[PDB]
Amino acid sequence: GTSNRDWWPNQLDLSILHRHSSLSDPMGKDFNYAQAFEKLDLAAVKRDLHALMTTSQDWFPADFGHYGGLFIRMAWHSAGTYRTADGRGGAGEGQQRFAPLNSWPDNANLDKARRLLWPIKQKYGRAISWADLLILTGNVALESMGFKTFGFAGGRADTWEPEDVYWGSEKIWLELSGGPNSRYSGDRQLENPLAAVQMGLIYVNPEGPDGNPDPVAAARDIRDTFARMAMNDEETVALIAGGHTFGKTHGAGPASNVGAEPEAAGIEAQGLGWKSAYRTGKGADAITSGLEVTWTTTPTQWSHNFFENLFGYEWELTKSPAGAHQWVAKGADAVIPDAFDPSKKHRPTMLTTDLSLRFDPAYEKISRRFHENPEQFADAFARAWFKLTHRDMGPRARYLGPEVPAEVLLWQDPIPAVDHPLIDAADAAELKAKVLASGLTVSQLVSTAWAAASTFRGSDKRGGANGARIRLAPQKDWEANQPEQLAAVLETLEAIRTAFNGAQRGGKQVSLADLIVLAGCAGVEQAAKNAGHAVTVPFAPGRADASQEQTDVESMAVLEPVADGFRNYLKGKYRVPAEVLLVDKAQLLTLSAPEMTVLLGGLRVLGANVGQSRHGVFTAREQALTNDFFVNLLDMGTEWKPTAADADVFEGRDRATGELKWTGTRVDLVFGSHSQLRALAEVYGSADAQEKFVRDFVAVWNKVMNLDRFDLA
Amino acid sequence: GTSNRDWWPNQLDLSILHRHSSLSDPMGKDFNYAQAFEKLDLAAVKRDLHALMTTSQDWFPADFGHYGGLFIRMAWHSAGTYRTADGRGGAGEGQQRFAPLNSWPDNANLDKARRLLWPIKQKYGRAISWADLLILTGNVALESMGFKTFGFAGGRADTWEPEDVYWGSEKIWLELSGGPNSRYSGDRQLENPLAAVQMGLIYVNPEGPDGNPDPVAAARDIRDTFARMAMNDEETVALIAGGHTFGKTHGAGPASNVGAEPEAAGIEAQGLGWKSAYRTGKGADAITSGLEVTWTTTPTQWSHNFFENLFGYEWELTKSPAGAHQWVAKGADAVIPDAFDPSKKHRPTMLTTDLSLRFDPAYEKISRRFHENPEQFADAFARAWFKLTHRDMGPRARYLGPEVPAEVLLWQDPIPAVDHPLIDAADAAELKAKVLASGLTVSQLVSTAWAAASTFRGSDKRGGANGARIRLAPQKDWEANQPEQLAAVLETLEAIRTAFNGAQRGGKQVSLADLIVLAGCAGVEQAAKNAGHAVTVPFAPGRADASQEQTDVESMAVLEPVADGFRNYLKGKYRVPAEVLLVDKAQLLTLSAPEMTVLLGGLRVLGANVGQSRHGVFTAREQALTNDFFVNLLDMGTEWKPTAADADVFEGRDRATGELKWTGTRVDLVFGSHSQLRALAEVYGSADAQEKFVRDFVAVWNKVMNLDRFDLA
Ligand code: HEM
Ligand code: HEM
Ligand code: NA
Ligand code: NA
């Protein structure tokens, strides 16, 4: 069946904005996951998980009689798809159970791990999500094997269809670098927003870069990919040595024995894949990665034996039974036990990427410290494992259950507690009038609140107006945010705040974060009034102000908007056309196509563009909230052509006279070009639409203001 | 960006079930188009349309100073994509403004037509849909040019994204037959459900079959394609001669002058396409089809000149200025006016497909009769134009506005008016008790009501339980409906009905159509009772019984289910795997994936399978409403393999012993294999899900029972 994508493969794709509708969701419209989870007997779930660890199923037998190593891998792959660039991937939506991640090569045999958990999922039903269960199981595996975890939060709601993510452009699984779709260029520069070295890997190649078993070069890939998943050197070493304290790899025979991944397998495989024709096809015969390495002398107990081996032997390049590069300890005794035969022992073995931890000089220092001081190792690993498995869950207000750690961590972008009475409706009316009386303009008010709120992204639930981080480094100096105009607006708002707070009794006060949003609300009200329409814009107080010392400046970098079509802004020249970047931003803000359309059309006539650009400002009454953008965009009396100097800027001239009426960008003109978006523009450009336009604009404005308000959830 | 479709191109696609969500719809969730339309000043819209006919725009000038011909083409193409096989296409969703149809080669320059209508659409806004406007404009073009139409109904709601339609498998526009994706095999047999001869045409090739200018062979294509759009010989001749009484074709120079279709054009074209480099690119220089034919001596007035010319000359094959085959009248004077130059006249010309109306023996007889009796021609064309433009609108209860014809037509599948008091709640309880006391089983009751209601399709809103056509030819004879079991159940229901109706006072009576649905509901209640649950099933009376004479047997054949996964039925072997056919049927029934899943699992345990097959009947308590199907389907203690005899039937055996537990088809097991469907099955197979399964089942059952109930809508 030939499709629109076939005929027009470069057309913009809006269907990413209409995922996760009530149609595809089996739960009722009123289902609340948090309310279900908060009644779960978590202690009972954990006891069930603890028993499951040592209850081997014959269809996929447990190594050493213990599934713990398998479940740790499962939970570290669930979390391990995360990219800091866009916040996409991670464990937060349980996406490992859908395409494509259910069938990535690096997730081979995790299908079996997830099937082992079905009887527990079934028992507890909607009270525990698959997304939560995947991570909980990893925690319980660690606990069962004598490791003390840092804690656990529930609250990851299940999703019901694949997330639309750019995983790269290669058309072959695990394709080595330098092909026609290479994810690398220059001196090994990995294209953003990717965080893995080959299509279908979690981070790096365990043999070494594109298969080359050099631990030093492997270390460069490890550091780069882990940084791109928000982990530094100490966290990276702790995680890799911590993980490889447990269990084993599987490569008993050649990879050509292994059949179709789950999405390609026959209907009779019932959701499983990688069926193997080698010997029994499982257990002692298992093939997963093709490597056959067992790290420690007690693979089912926490120890400091990984670093004892790493530093206590010299290592020789060798091959698994599948033909993959791996390393074996020169001259060592057989001290490592066998997974199934108590009469058999083995010499210590290592991956190329394990030896990276000793042969990269910076790693070596940390590894040595962890070797000599295993208590430091345990604490680092516990903290890293928590961060790994929670880094995409958003603010601490989303954390549920009885095991949530009390310590507040810097990477959580923490918001202080509110410890005073909030402002009421009369107060908010008073403060809006004061803001408007100050002389701040519609454009200043709307711009500033947009700048503060529009850093939110639903992918990892970072960003938003809560915290008032727009006043801090680095937000206050981002080019998009117009640092000098921003400073003058914040100065004026801070004086209003000081005067209001100074007059109160009984502890009542307003945060700057709330006042920034409320001021933006006053700007939108005033613009409606400028148009001849009285409206109230909803506002919910309760935000608090975070300090500079509670703000990690390096971590905040990835939230900078380098493309924001809502402010007609592009920081530099990109490969991806600007309209595709606009749809990407709308996806992160959680906007539908109709929401994106309304919002952009209003922002244009309110004066939100960076630098007061005239591009797309299709009105002769700026700072009035009207549907002018749409009426003027759709007027056939105007003809559009790209400029000589710049093919991405367009002039709109009267078709009869030739007079210049307007200019615009690709972001502006796409609403008059794309067949689906133009249909939406038509609704708001109709003669009957002014009331609808205003109401829908206020709604989507308020939605954006509240994106990070999980305290009200 | 590589996608799941790239990696696994033959995977099932569930996103066709979750199209048209509230997310993509710009209107509020309460918007009711009918209520908006009923307040439209239709007379005002028509005056504006009359004005527009002769208001030529410079950017695409009007032939002969009158856009009427262009708009009639526009309206006939809007309606002309309809296929009787699945009810898909037609005018009823305004889909000509979206991909792919906005950019089909046969729809070249209709973009110009639709843009000419924007000012009217804008003026009247949501009170007239594009879908209604395209057809009304065709009606007004006809009226402006002196032809009296049979009438017009509003009520086609606009849609906001492309419909998922199989238009064929060719990967080249207009590809001639016999290629690697040929829509033809054997003795020119067109694959169902297609209704056109080449990809991107409405019906047939105007030069002749695969470009061969033989009018006799072209006639075979015309008959076959028009039959597949529900039109017989009389209606087909009326429509083609009626249409081609107006306007002209356009092929003033070579097709290589014409640039990208609208979906491929540059952003600056603002939704238009086919920009031409030939001379002025438009008007006298226009190129659309490549043919250059003007049929009558008065192209902007209704006349009887089409058949005068067709019969009054002999015809000579020749070529247009673009090189396409067409026909010119031997020895004729230049009597046909020129569209732009009053000093120029032209000889009469015809398409290959026009000569088909004279050289096919069956058409010649009709054409002659129309020539000799022009008033018969006019009436037939008026009636056929109404049928063409309304054939996909469904029951007459959906028809809005003040121009709706009073005459009831056979192709509207008419249902008599109800002229008596309906049964009340007390009556319905009485009739349910009598049905249960008769001996009829859960399985019989559920099967029969399913059979009656599940003929509905949302594509053209035909079918459903209203009319009790299940008791008539041909429904009573269809294999899926189990003719002999069906006869015994209807006999019993008719005796209950006779006795209840004979006891009533006033005129109160129950229809068989209502009783069949009510009895189905009682079966569902009894099944819930068998399972230990107290359940009420909603029921709405008001269906009526249609007669055999109000039921066209040939038209009814396209509604026969040859595949119904919901009854585990496949009438023979098909190219498309059965699960794809299941999702296709769920789309026609307007079901989401969660609705499809719930429904299918319940029907299996209630005994709805054709022939009492055990396939998918995964319960030991048949005729009890439980979630057994899911709990057993997801049990890892069972292993599944295709049988020796039949690769589409599967045996489910105990994994430990090897004992046979169950058998199933692809339709059954896809719920345990497809990663999204399995996630749905898991919700319903959990330990907390029994009451959720029952309540969700009753909701979807009631939905299906009410799909055709536009009298209550
Ligand atoms: C450079 C980073 C990493 C590389 C290249 C790497 C590579 C691999 C490979 C190739 C396997 C064998 C899969 C099989 O054949 O069954 C594996 C196993 C495993 N990995 Fe890692 N890994 C890395 C980091 C991590 C981290 C961060 C953790 C958790 C904190 C982890 C935990 C494990 C565990 C527990 C297993 C054993 C699974 C079992 O017993 O069945 N790995 N690793
Ligand atoms: C065998 C069926 C038919 C074929 C092959 C056919 C073919 C065509 C072609 C090729 C054109 C010229 C397009 C252009 O170059 O601008 C055309 C024009 C048109 N057709 Fe037909 N047509 C058919 C049936 C119909 C029907 C059923 C109607 C309406 C009842 C219709 C009404 C028109 C009109 C009004 C035009 C003139 C357009 C104008 O003046 O701009 N045709 N047709
Ligand atoms: Na994420
Ligand atoms: Na249709």
Rounded to 10 deg, the angle between the B593-606 and B442-453 helix axes is: 140
B157-178 b/e (C-beta count within 10 Å ≥ 16 → b): bbbbbbbbbbbbbbeebebbee
φ/ψ of residue B626, rounded to 5: -130, 175
Q: Which string of b and e fits B63-85 if b means at least 16 CB within 10 Å?
A: bbebbbbbbbbbbbbbbbbbbbe
**In chain A, which residues fall in CATH 1.10.420.10?**
168-372, 565-688
**What would the 3-class secondary structure string for B135-176 be?**
HHHHHHHHHHCCCCCCCCCECCCCCCCCCCCCCCCCCCCCCC
DSSP string, A384-453: HHHHHHHTTS-SGGG-BSTT---S--GGG---PPP-SPPP-HHHHHHHHHHHHHTT--HHHHHHHHHHHH
Q: Does B666 touch chain A (CB under 8 A)?
A: yes
- Output the residue whose Cα is nearest ligand 1's atom 3: A240
The architecture (CATH level 2) of B408-564+689-713 comes to Orthogonal Bundle (1.10)
Residues of chain A with CATH 1.10.520.10: 1-167+373-407, 408-564+689-713
Contacts of A330 (CB under 8 A, 6+ apart): A313, A314, A315, A316
Maximum Cα–Cα distance across chain B: 94
Which CATH code, of 1.10.420.10, 3.40.50.11290, 3.30.1700.10, 3.40.50.300, is assigned to B168-372? Answer: 1.10.420.10
- Does any CB of chain B come closer than 8 Å to the CB of residue A688? yes
What is the rounded CA–CA span in Å between residue A635 and residue B271?
12
What b/e readout covers B231-270, taking b as 16+ CB neighbours within 10 angstroms? bebbbbbbbbbbbbbbbbbbbbbebebbeebbbebbbbbb
Show the tokens assigned to A546: 């975070």
Which residue blocks in A179-289 are alpha helix, DSSP H? 215-227, 233-243
Q: Do the chains contact at B1 and A684, CB–CB below 8 Å? A: no
Distance between CA A63 and CA A69 in Å, rounded? 8
Q: Which residue has the tokens 């866009």?
A: A86
Q: Strand pairing of B184-185 and B189-190?
A: antiparallel
Q: Which two tokens stand for residue B229?
A: 């759009």
Cβ proximity of B565 and B91 under 8 Å: no
A630 touches chain B (CB under 8 A): no
| Ligand 1 midpoint to CA A85 (Å) | 24
Question: Residue holding tokens 């990967």?
Answer: B171
Please name the method used to determine this structure: X-ray
**According to DSSP H, which parts of B343-473 are helical?**
352-359, 361-372, 374-390, 425-437, 442-453
Give the whole-angstrom CA distance, residue B238 versus residue B449.
40
The answer to whether residues A300 and A286 touch, using CB atoms and an 8 Å cutoff, is no
Distance A129 CA to ligand 1 centre (A): 24
Q: Cα separation of A96 and A163, whole Å? A: 11
Asked if A655 and B59 come within 8 Å (Cβ–Cβ), the reply is: yes
Q: Which of residues 309-328 of A touch B (CB under 8 A)?
A: none
Contact yes or no for A11 and B689 at CB 8 A? no
* Burial class of residue B536, CB neighbours in 10 A (0-12, 13-18, 19+): exposed
Helix, strand, or coil (residue A457): strand
DSSP notation for A108-141: TTHHHHHHHTHHHHHHHGGGS-HHHHHHHHHHHH
Question: If you measure from the C-alpha of residue B352 to the centroid of ligand 2, how many angstroms do you get, rounded to a whole number?
Answer: 12
What are φ and ψ of residue B508, in 5° steps? -60, 135
Distances (CA, A) of A594 to A415, A586, A630, B648: 32, 10, 13, 44
Contact A679, B98 (CB under 8 A): yes
B555 Cα: distance to centroid of ligand 2 (angstroms) = 26
Can you state the percent helix, strand and coil of chain A, rounding each to 5? 45, 5, 45
Other beta carbons within 10 Å of A407: 10
Mutation choice for A interface testing from B39, B173, B181, B673 by most A CBs within 10 A: B673
DSSP state of A148: P
Hey, what are A690's tokens?
Answer: 């002014």
Residue A694: phi, psi to the nearest 5? -60, -45
List Cα–Cα distances, B430 to B211, B436, B450, in angstroms. Answer: 66, 10, 22
Contact B6 A171 (CB under 8 A): yes
Backbone dihedral angles phi then psi of residue A252, each to the nearest 5 degrees: -65, -20
**B565 and B589 in contact (C-beta within 8 Å)?**
no
Residues 6+ apart with CB under 8 A from A498: none
**Which chain B residues are within 8 Å of A269, Cβ to Cβ?**
673
d(CA A289, CA A276): 12
B245 closest CA partner among B136, B378, B135: B378
User: Exposed, middle or buried, A653 (CB in 10 Å: 0-12/13-18/19+)?
Assistant: middle
- The Cα–Cα gap between A315 and A256 comes to 28
- DSSP letter assigned to residue B557: G
Q: Which of A77, A325, A346, A674 is catalytic?
A: A77
**Rounded Cα distance, A328 and A491, in Å:** 64
Question: Rounded to the nearest 10 degrees, what angle do helices B690-705 and B593-606 cross at?
Answer: 100
Residue among A18, A27, A683 minimizing CB distance to B23: A18
Residues near A43 by Cβ (< 8 Å), separated by ≥ 6? Answer: none
- For residue A150, what are its two tokens? 């840092």
- Do residues B591 and B579 make contact, with C-beta atoms less than 8 angstroms apart? no
Q: Any idea which residue has 């107990």 for tokens?
A: A301
Return the closest-CA partner of residue B614 out of B579, B568, B653: B568
Residue among B283, B56, B65, B81 at smallest CA distance from B163: B81
Residues 6+ apart with CB under 8 A from B109: B60, B70, B250, B274, B286, B288
Whose CA is closest to atom 3 on ligand 2? B240
Nearest Cα residue to atom 11 of ligand 1: A249
Pocket test for ligand 2, best of B53, B64, B72 (most atoms within 8 A of CB): B72
Asked whether B681 and B633 are in contact (CB, 8 A), the reply is yes
- Find the discontinuities in chain A where C to next N exceeds 2.5 angstroms and give the residue preceding each: none
- A680 HSE (CA, 13 A, CB side): 25
Tokens 């197979």 sit at which residue?
B685
Contact B661, B653 (CB under 8 A): yes
Task: Report the C-alpha gap between B593 and A445 in whole angstroms.
Answer: 45
What's the first-to-final CA gap in chain B, in angstroms? 44
Of B263, B634, B675, the CB nearest to A8: B263
Chain B contact present for A115, CB below 8 A: yes
From chain B, pick out residues whose CB is under 8 angstroms from the CB of A171: 2, 6
Using DSSP, state whether A654 is helix, strand or coil. strand
CA distance B360 to B341: 36
Task: Collect all residues of chain A within an 8 Å Cβ-Cβ radius of residue B57.
Answer: 636
The reply to whether residue B98 touches residue A676, judged by beta carbons under 8 angstroms, is: yes
Q: Mind giving me the DSSP string for B442-494?
A: HHHHHHHHHHHHTT-BTTTTB-SSTB-GGGSTTGGG-GGG-HHHHHHHHHHHH
Rounded Cα distance, B192 and B169, in Å = 12
Our CA angle for B89, B90, B92, nearest 5°, is 110
In terms of Cβ atoms closer than 10 Å to its own Cβ (0-12, 13-18, 19+), residue A234 is middle
Yes or no, beta carbons of B160 and A676 under 8 Å apart = yes
**Residue of chain B with shortest Cα separation from A670:** B267
Please, which residues bridge with residue A662 across strands? A652
Stretch (H or E) spanning B113: helix B110-116
Give the sign of the dihedral formed by CA A693, CA A698, CA A704, CA A709: negative
Q: Ligand 2: list residues with CB < 6 Å.
A: B 63, 69-70, 72-73, 76, 203-204, 206, 222, 239-240, 242-244, 246-250, 288-289, 291, 353
Contact B247, B70 (CB under 8 A): yes
How long, in residues, is chain B? 713
CA distance B519 to chain A (A): 28
How far is the centre of ligand 2, averaged over its atoms, from the C-alpha of B242 (Å)? 10
Closest CA to B304 of B150, B151, B147, B72: B147
Breaks in chain B at C–N > 2.5 Å: after which residues? none
Cα dihedral B110→B112→B114→B119 (10° resolution): -170
Peptide bond into B100 cis (omega under 30): yes
CATH class of B1-167+373-407: mainly alpha
A377-381: long-range contacts, CB 8 A cutoff, minimum separation 24? A377/A238, A377/A241, A377/A242, A377/A304, A377/A307, A378/A147, A378/A148, A378/A302, A380/A234, A380/A235, A380/A237, A380/A238, A381/A147, A381/A238, A381/A239, A381/A241, A381/A242
In degrees, rounded to 5, the angle at the alpha carbon of residue B365 between the alpha carbons of residues B361 and B369 is 165
Q: Is the minimum distance from the CB of A76 to ligand 1 under 6 angstroms?
A: yes
Task: Establish whether the linkage from the previous residue to B421 is cis, with ω within 30° of 0.
Answer: no
Nearest CA in chain B to A31: B692
Nearest residue on chain B to A104, judged by CA atoms?
Answer: B7
Q: Is the distance from CB of B79 to CB of B107 less than 8 angstroms?
A: no
Going by the annotation, the residues of the binding site of B for heme b are 244
Measured distance CA(B137)–CA(A617) in Å, rounded: 34
Q: What is B329-344 written as a DSSP string?
A: ETT----EEPSS-TT-
Determine contact, residues A461/A513, Cβ cutoff 8 Å.
no
Does B206 sit behind a cis peptide bond, omega within 30 degrees of 0 on the bond before it? no
Q: How far is A212 from chain B (nearest CA, A)?
A: 26
Secondary structure (DSSP) of B560-610: --SEEGGGTEESS--SS-HHHHHHHHHHHTT--HHHHHHHHHHHHHHT-SG
Three-class DSSP category at B128 = coil
> A603 and A589 in contact (C-beta within 8 Å)?
no
Given this structure, which CATH class describes domain B565-688? Answer: mainly alpha
Task: Chain B: give the shortest CA distance to residue A246, in Å.
Answer: 27
